[PDB]
Amino acid sequence: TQQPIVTGTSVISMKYDNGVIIAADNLGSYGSLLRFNGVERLIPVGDNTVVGISGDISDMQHIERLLKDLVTENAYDNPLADAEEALEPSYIFEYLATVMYQRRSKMNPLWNAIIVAGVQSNGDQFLRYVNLLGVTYSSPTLATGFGAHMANPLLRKVVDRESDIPKTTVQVAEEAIVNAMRVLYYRDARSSRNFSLAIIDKNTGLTFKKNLQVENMKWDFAKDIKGYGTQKI
Template sequence: MNHHQEHWGRPRSDIYGPYNAAIHNAGPHARTQQPSITGTSVIALKYDNGVMLAADNLASYGSLARFTDQERLIKVGRETIVGISGDVSDLQYIEELLERLIIEDEYEHDGHHLRAPHVYEYLSRVFYNRRSKLDPLWNAVLVAGKNDDGSAFLAYVDLLGVTFSSPSLATGYGAYLAIPLLRKLVSDQGDEKKVTESEARAAIDESMKVLFYRDARSLDKYSVAKVSLDGEVTIEKNVKCQHMSWRFAKDIRGYGTQKN
């Protein structure tokens, strides 16, 4: 006896049309359980005239440094920068969502445009919606730009829909290594008024160098973005860590063939 599903009793083809046997080849519906190609930390800092962000250009396939030219700082609209760490395919999906959002907004030609808080609210809803469907976007995102009142804006949202704001933020490994360095300049709201652009840039460069030393999934080539309070947005690409030195490595004990 033939027990295959295709040969069970079914509606007549001359009445309901030909039977589609392809339905038996459909597999179960699955969700992505973990990211595959990922980018590491994004760091950001407020200063007296805006916000500064940095992210390296590496996309890792597990422990393999697979792509060394992946840009993870995205300009959105006229005066907003979005920095994304985590899964690169989800990064590309988010970039497409934001592009559609800006195109739709610009259709109106009403003199208004989306600012950083609007982009941030949109992303927070997208991330929480996907989390609620048990199909999260495997990313953590920093949004930087200007508030409606002209002040600097910097906020965070992750794959669980968790949102918060601070004068200094970082994702990935940077949350452990870069944040203490950045908080030497800005540890509380209002401290950014005392920090100049050159001091902020020095702290960003130093943090990216430390991350290259200590984060096995980072690169010594990175991009730096700046959003000033007058609305100017600049992105400097292919910045290299300067004055690199591995002399400290000779003092590390407990690994390899080194002896005390």
């Protein structure tokens, strides 16, 4: 048993017609101190998977090394390491889920919530969640932390059920994701303006965008707000 020290906030994601999108801001908080400002929390695995991680950053860095070591190992004595015997999103997830549950079962968890986003060999979208308890689940949209409370409601208006996925283009999905990130920036005290976003598309592969910013922010209406009830000036 421990307690998280340096932490990352929400990871948010959804499925669309040809793939998946995942996003997470670039902050590592130290309680209420916004300590570290260039932390990458989306970690690509090969060209078909992106693992997004929230919670304890020291444990995130450990998991990141496990994933890197997974790639090294899969290539061993494997002539088809960059073809039929490449790592799938589903292999990477099952492995992480096994580790998370094992660690919880030993009363020594990896203090994280994780979303594995990718596209399988057969073109199928993969999106699944696992956390420090070993709890796993799938949905057309997934989000951790604050994102679960604020991003999901918005993302579910785009894809509310399985049949909405083929009707959702990458442009509509990305815009939904980017808006959710703005909303989290407004309302989550441990969020940052700077984030990363990754698209895994079955046709165009993995697009990884860094140094994105929240823009088109509404603050002007604040000039008219005075006092807390009766004050006029």
